[PDB]
Amino acid sequence: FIDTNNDGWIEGDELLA
Ligand SMILES: [La+3]
Numbered sequence: 294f295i296d297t298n299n300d301g302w303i304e305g306d307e308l309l310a
Pocket of ligand 1: 296297298299300301302303304307
């Protein structure tokens with residue numbers, strides 16, 4: 294995954310792919 298706001302947790306739109 295790629296964390297799009299960079300907080301150290303994958304959630305929301307980050308999990309999409
Ligand atoms: La995040």
